[PDB]
Scaffold this active site. Structure first.
Site, short mmCIF file in Angstrom:
data_model
loop_
_atom_site.label_atom_id
_atom_site.label_comp_id
_atom_site.label_asym_id
_atom_site.label_seq_id
_atom_site.Cartn_x
_atom_site.Cartn_y
_atom_site.Cartn_z
N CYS A 126 12.15 43.66 -36.95
CA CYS A 126 11.94 42.43 -36.04
C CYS A 126 11.33 41.17 -36.78
O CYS A 126 10.13 41.40 -37.08
CB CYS A 126 10.92 42.72 -34.73
SG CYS A 126 12.08 43.46 -33.48
N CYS A 171 5.19 40.46 -47.08
CA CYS A 171 6.00 40.24 -48.30
C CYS A 171 5.03 41.30 -49.31
O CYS A 171 3.78 41.03 -49.43
CB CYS A 171 5.99 38.72 -48.80
SG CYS A 171 6.53 38.50 -50.49
N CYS A 189 6.34 32.50 -50.98
CA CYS A 189 6.40 32.71 -52.35
C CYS A 189 7.66 32.88 -53.05
O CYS A 189 7.87 32.96 -54.06
CB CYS A 189 5.40 34.03 -52.82
SG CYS A 189 6.21 35.64 -52.47
ZN LIG Z 1 5.89 36.13 -50.51
#
Ligand SMILES: [Zn+2]
Length: 153
Positions: free
Chosen positions: A124, A101, A55
């Site tokens: 990580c 996200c 995105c």
């Molecule tokens: Zn995203």
């Protein structure tokens, strides 16, 4: 945050996914199936911003002057804490958490409890989940959101 964290619309999500490789889809769109990776990020300019491959949200800043410690790849820091969500799951408990996200919920990596003080955290990050924008270059803005996302990061 000056960024709009509203998720992609269904049409937007389909379009962005259509642009991903099979490997990218395997990493970004799945949760709890793949082996973890702790990317070291040795393949880019030191000064820029790693964005969500799906995105475009700016996620992690790298800079020659950053010193976040050994729980992060060299020169990394969070771009904005609001841009990532940590997920705890009873399947793992204190063993690890998933990093996603905050806008599109795509898989970014894991936090492990084996990092240096004071946080004791190791970040990580899967390099497949991230694209790179060098400082001075406008963000990718695949969702075509107005405002800060129309500028360099
Ligand atoms: Zn995203």
């Amino acid at each position: 945050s000056q960024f709009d964290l509203t998720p992609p619309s269904p049409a937007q999500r389909d379009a962005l996914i259509a642009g991903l490789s099979d490997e990218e889809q395997r990493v970004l769109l799945h949760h709890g199936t793949e082996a973890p990776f702790c990317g070291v990020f040795l393949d880019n300019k030191l000064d820029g911003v790693y964005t969500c491959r799906l995105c475009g949200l700016p996620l992690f800043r790298s800079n020659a002057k950053f010193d976040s410690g050994t729980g992060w790849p060299s020169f990394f820091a969070p771009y904005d804490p609001a841009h990532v969500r940590e997920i705890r799951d009873t399947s793992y408990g204190m063993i690890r958490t998933e990093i996603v996200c905050a806008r599109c919920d795509s898989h970014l990596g894991h936090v492990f409890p084996d990092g240096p003080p004071p946080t004791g955290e190791r970040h990580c990050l899967n390099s497949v989940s991230l694209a790179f924008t060098e400082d001075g270059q406008p963000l990718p803005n695949p969702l075509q959101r107005a405002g800060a996302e129309t500028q360099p990061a």
